[PDB]
Design an enzyme around this catalytic site. Structure first.
Site, short mmCIF file in Angstrom:
data_model
loop_
_atom_site.label_atom_id
_atom_site.label_comp_id
_atom_site.label_asym_id
_atom_site.label_seq_id
_atom_site.Cartn_x
_atom_site.Cartn_y
_atom_site.Cartn_z
N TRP A 103 -18.96 13.97 -3.90
CA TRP A 103 -17.89 12.98 -3.93
C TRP A 103 -17.33 12.97 -5.34
CZ3 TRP A 103 -22.94 11.49 -2.51
CH2 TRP A 103 -23.73 11.02 -3.57
N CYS A 113 -22.57 19.62 -14.63
CA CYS A 113 -22.50 18.61 -13.58
C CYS A 113 -23.26 17.33 -13.91
CB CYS A 113 -23.03 19.18 -12.26
SG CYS A 113 -22.98 17.97 -10.92
C1 HEM Z 1 -22.47 14.28 -5.36
C2 HEM Z 1 -21.44 13.99 -6.19
C3 HEM Z 1 -21.08 14.84 -7.35
C4 HEM Z 1 -20.48 14.38 -8.46
C5 HEM Z 1 -20.04 12.95 -8.67
C6 HEM Z 1 -20.29 15.48 -9.36
C7 HEM Z 1 -19.66 15.36 -10.59
C8 HEM Z 1 -19.15 16.47 -11.27
C9 HEM Z 1 -18.20 16.44 -12.34
C10 HEM Z 1 -17.49 15.21 -12.87
C11 HEM Z 1 -18.01 17.72 -12.76
C12 HEM Z 1 -17.10 18.19 -13.88
C13 HEM Z 1 -15.69 18.55 -13.44
C14 HEM Z 1 -14.82 18.29 -14.66
O1 HEM Z 1 -15.16 17.41 -15.49
O2 HEM Z 1 -13.78 18.93 -14.86
C15 HEM Z 1 -18.87 18.55 -11.99
C16 HEM Z 1 -18.97 19.91 -12.21
C17 HEM Z 1 -19.79 20.67 -11.38
N1 HEM Z 1 -20.55 20.25 -10.34
FE1 HEM Z 1 -20.90 18.47 -9.74
N2 HEM Z 1 -20.79 16.58 -8.81
C18 HEM Z 1 -21.31 16.29 -7.59
C19 HEM Z 1 -21.88 17.16 -6.65
C20 HEM Z 1 -22.05 18.53 -6.85
C21 HEM Z 1 -22.61 19.43 -5.92
C22 HEM Z 1 -23.04 19.03 -4.52
C23 HEM Z 1 -22.69 20.68 -6.52
C24 HEM Z 1 -23.18 21.97 -5.96
C25 HEM Z 1 -24.10 22.09 -4.98
C26 HEM Z 1 -22.15 20.53 -7.84
C27 HEM Z 1 -22.04 21.53 -8.78
C28 HEM Z 1 -21.16 21.38 -9.87
C29 HEM Z 1 -20.72 22.57 -10.62
C30 HEM Z 1 -21.14 24.00 -10.40
C31 HEM Z 1 -19.87 22.13 -11.56
C32 HEM Z 1 -19.14 22.99 -12.60
C33 HEM Z 1 -17.81 23.48 -12.00
C34 HEM Z 1 -17.02 24.40 -12.89
O3 HEM Z 1 -17.55 25.06 -13.82
O4 HEM Z 1 -15.79 24.53 -12.66
N3 HEM Z 1 -21.80 19.20 -8.01
N4 HEM Z 1 -19.60 17.77 -11.10
C1 LIG Z 2 -18.89 19.76 -6.33
C2 LIG Z 2 -18.01 18.98 -7.29
C3 LIG Z 2 -17.96 17.58 -7.19
C4 LIG Z 2 -17.16 16.85 -8.07
N1 LIG Z 2 -17.09 15.48 -8.03
N2 LIG Z 2 -16.41 17.50 -8.99
C5 LIG Z 2 -16.44 18.84 -9.12
C6 LIG Z 2 -15.56 19.44 -10.20
C7 LIG Z 2 -14.80 20.63 -9.67
C8 LIG Z 2 -13.70 21.11 -10.61
C9 LIG Z 2 -12.39 20.65 -10.41
C10 LIG Z 2 -11.33 21.07 -11.22
C11 LIG Z 2 -10.12 20.64 -11.01
N3 LIG Z 2 -9.05 20.21 -10.78
C12 LIG Z 2 -11.59 22.00 -12.22
C13 LIG Z 2 -12.89 22.48 -12.42
C14 LIG Z 2 -13.10 23.50 -13.52
C15 LIG Z 2 -12.57 24.85 -13.01
C16 LIG Z 2 -13.02 26.03 -13.85
C17 LIG Z 2 -12.06 26.90 -14.37
C18 LIG Z 2 -12.47 27.99 -15.14
C19 LIG Z 2 -11.45 28.95 -15.72
C20 LIG Z 2 -13.84 28.19 -15.37
C21 LIG Z 2 -14.76 27.29 -14.83
N4 LIG Z 2 -16.10 27.46 -15.04
N5 LIG Z 2 -14.33 26.24 -14.10
C22 LIG Z 2 -13.98 22.05 -11.61
C23 LIG Z 2 -17.23 19.61 -8.26
#
Ligand code: HEM
Ligand SMILES: Cc1cc(N)nc(CCc2cc(C#N)cc(CCc3cc(C)cc(N)n3)c2)c1
Ligand code: HEM
Ligand SMILES: Cc1cc(N)nc(CCc2cc(C#N)cc(CCc3cc(C)cc(N)n3)c2)c1
Ligand SMILES: C[C@H](O)[C@H](O)[C@H]1CNc2nc(N)[nH]c(=O)c2N1
Ligand SMILES: C[C@H](O)[C@H](O)[C@H]1CNc2nc(N)[nH]c(=O)c2N1
Ligand SMILES: [Cl-]
Ligand SMILES: [Cl-]
Lengths: 362, 362
Positions: free
Chosen positions: B237, B65
């Site tokens: 967001w 993140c």
């Molecule tokens: C506040 C604005 C936030 C922004 C702009 C943001 C941005 C992002 C982005 C760009 C990703 C990667 C998704 C991708 O590239 O495919 C991500 C992943 C993630 N974010 Fe954040 N995030 C935010 C808030 C949060 C919050 C509030 C949480 C949890 C309390 C969180 C937990 C995570 C987690 C766990 C992932 C990994 C998801 C996965 O493995 O699929 N984020 N975030």
């Molecule tokens: C809270 C929050 C805020 C923000 N701005 N963005 C996110 C990213 C969430 C997310 C979206 C997609 C999509 N579409 C895939 C993914 C990846 C899905 C995925 C897929 C698999 C197989 C494993 C793994 N760890 N994750 C994540 C979250």
């Protein structure tokens, strides 16, 4: 231990190399000879076939290289016979000429004598055979900042640059037995350069950008069957993003994005305008256009990734494990537009290979 | 073993949490209580303070993140009291409303009862609370392909989509003791969407693109001190590239780059024209413009990376190790324009954290 490492690396390489060459029956006799040779001399000498195939295998094994589809057509020049600094200089000049090939770039490696006891016979100081100098004095920055330390070392040795933004560094190398390296100015007739213009935006030429045609990396060691060829410069042709997204765009390199934004007529004031992204795209379009128009080989990152996909397919068909470094294989613009982004790669080190080494200056 | 794992995770979490909260003296008494509670019941219950700080720590520890600068202002809603499917539904509706906040998005997590014996109390089937359906029948593709399997599962349960490209999936979840999940249509008044237009190119609206305002991830497990909250949807967001470079651009998602190229008036015929790159930039400019104009929170990737730099600095100042996954932290366009590209990150797993889990369908 020294010799045991050598013998073990030798056994593995010869077996693998001869298997690929359909010479598997000759392995035992060749290994016998090598063992005796290590016994007497402390090392062994590669056949021209082994050396050529070894350098090709090393490219095939280079995890960070997207261009590997063409590994088997590497042009290998064997210069293990050089003994004088004039012979080294002339070999390097020759490499530039034959690799450049009037713009139709030939991937080429020139191999100099290997280390003996860890004792280098030839030590090349350049990072690339063709590269621009860099200067930083009293706040004032000129040329390529990545070359500042090498530039200063050359100037300690009596070279003097004109202090344009594109001074060609001299070839600089040291021979076994010499305290100091020698340097030689590059003949300009050997060095192709490309002025950067844009296909649609006439004002782009106001930036007065240019780059050299051929990247010839000269600070990696080629390791083949336990033999360490520390001096073995090699080249391909550029992928356009190397010039347009790294060399000319990085803030710690030529840092041109604000100037590009200005000439393409967009503001460079707000992150949300994505002006850096837009400038990157136009600069990279200009780079490809300019090389193509001049008739100098170049590949765009989409085509390069498609070629790499074929390399992956070819490895699978051949029953060879594929290794790669995802962090270097993705291009620095639009990486998610390539198949590479969505796959994973085993970053294991397989030999023969090319390895980075310490620079004597710093 | 079950209980020993729990106790060990509990000790580590309570000590760390109470240290951060300036409550270090209360650790021993709290741990004593917890040990007895594990002894009798096989588990323990978090205080509201522990639960809130735990969810914040979990965000801070999320290696993938880029948005973590704001970890300490997470709004934590404790719904460990829910027992009925109407209460779950209403909690999810409430999350959407309070997180959306009329467009000024509030990062929020709603926490439902945790697993007991690995037995889920509530099992949410949605990947995000708001997401579009996807259909693939007889060659014909509609909507979001990433949602095809969940869409088919919903339709098995009596839901029917209108088969536009942007059908909202119903909320769908199963309660402990029920063989089948229940589903509920989302009230449209709760769901903000943004039509995608371009600041300069009027024809962009001909693509009829839109996206939803708030990403609310609902298929990760929050683990805090050995307690597994499998149902705990959270939102931030968007960063604009998520919508413009992944959701709308990927060939296996909405696949819009050729259509974007057409409306912005460039050919999509030659790799060397970098038309995909140019289309990506304009699509991503449109996304940011459109969210900003409507008054819905969004961040661009440059600003996001700058915020992450501050998170790195804050971690160092606090004496906390920083962990990160470079491959996810770099944005999918212009990654080398961010400081992240040029640094390395320790991808170690630290708990509390969020973890992916199996979906019951497939
Ligand atoms: C506040 C604005 C936030 C922004 C702009 C943001 C941005 C992002 C982005 C760009 C990703 C990667 C998704 C991708 O590239 O495919 C991500 C992943 C993630 N974010 Fe954040 N995030 C935010 C808030 C949060 C919050 C509030 C949480 C949890 C309390 C969180 C937990 C995570 C987690 C766990 C992932 C990994 C998801 C996965 O493995 O699929 N984020 N975030
Ligand atoms: C809270 C929050 C805020 C923000 N701005 N963005 C996110 C990213 C969430 C997310 C979206 C997609 C999509 N579409 C895939 C993914 C990846 C899905 C995925 C897929 C698999 C197989 C494993 C793994 N760890 N994750 C994540 C979250
Ligand atoms: C034929 C055209 C070639 C192309 C287009 C190409 C492309 C590239 C690119 C883009 C990189 C990464 C540089 C960066 O992103 O910073 C790279 C790295 C590399 N390439 Fe290739 N390459 C080619 C030929 C060769 C040849 C002929 C060899 C050796 C025989 C080679 C060996 C390597 C090695 C060793 C690296 C890693 C360099 C390092 O660690 O600094 N490549 N290549
Ligand atoms: C500290 C350190 C370690 C390490 N392993 N590598 C490096 C240098 C990386 C690198 C930088 C540039 C540049 N500028 C060019 C290159 C060459 C890329 C290349 C090489 C070839 C043969 C062809 C082609 N198109 N491009 C590499 C530094
Ligand atoms: C696993 C595979 O390498 C895949 O492309 C990863 C790469 N990096 C990523 N980075 C982000 N931010 N989001 C993703 O979905 C992925 N996918
Ligand atoms: C080491 C650090 O992560 C650095 O940015 C790496 C990232 N990936 C790269 N990829 C390429 N192709 N070239 C590079 O110089 C780098 N640098
Ligand atoms: Cl280079
Ligand atoms: Cl999303």
């Amino acid at each position: 231990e020294e010799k045991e490492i050598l013998w073990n690396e030798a056994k593995a390489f010869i077996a693998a190399c001869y298997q690929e060459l359909g010479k598997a029956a000759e392995v035992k006799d060749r290994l016998a000879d090598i063992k005796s040779e290590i016994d007497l001399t402390g090392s062994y000498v590669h056949t021209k076939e082994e050396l050529e195939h070894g350098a090709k295998m090393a490219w095939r094994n280079s995890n960070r290289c997207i261009g590997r589809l063409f590994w088997n057509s590497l042009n290998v020049i064997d210069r293990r016979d050089v003994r004088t600094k004039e012979e080294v200089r002339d070999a390097l000049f020759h490499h530039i000429e034959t690799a450049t090939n009037n713009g139709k770039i030939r991937p080429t490696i020139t191999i100099f004598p290997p280390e003996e006891k860890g004792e280098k016979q030839v030590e090349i100081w350049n990072h690339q055979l063709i590269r621009y100098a860099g200067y930083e004095s009293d706040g004032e920055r000129i040329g390529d900042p990545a070359s500042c330390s090498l530039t200063a070392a050359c100037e300690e040795l009596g070279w003097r640059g004109e202090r344009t933004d594109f001074d060609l560094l001299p070839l600089i190398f040291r021979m076994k037995g010499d305290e100091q390296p020698v340097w030689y100015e590059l003949p300009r007739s050997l060095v192709i350069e490309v002025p950067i213009t844009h296909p649609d935006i006439e004002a782009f030429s106001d930036l007065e950008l240019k780059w050299y045609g051929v990247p010839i990396i000269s600070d990696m060691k080629l390791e083949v069957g336990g033999i360490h060829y520390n001096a073995a410069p090699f080249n391909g042709w550029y992928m356009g993003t190397e010039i347009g997204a790294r060399n000319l765009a990085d803030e710690k390199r030529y840092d041109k994005l604000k100037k590009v934004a200005s000439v393409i007529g967009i503001a460079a004031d707000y992150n949300t305008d994505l002006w850096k992204d837009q400038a990157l795209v136009e600069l990279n379009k200009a780079v490809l256009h300019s090389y193509k128009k001049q008739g100098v080989s170049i590949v765009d990152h989409h085509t390069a990734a498609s070629q790499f996909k074929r390399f992956e397919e070819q490895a699978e068909e051949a029953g060879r494990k594929l290794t790669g470094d995802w962090t270097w294989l993705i291009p620095p613009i639009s990486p998610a537009a390539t198949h590479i982004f969505h796959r994973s790669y085993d970053n294991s080190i397989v030999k023969p290979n090319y390895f980075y080494q310490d620079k004597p200056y710093e």
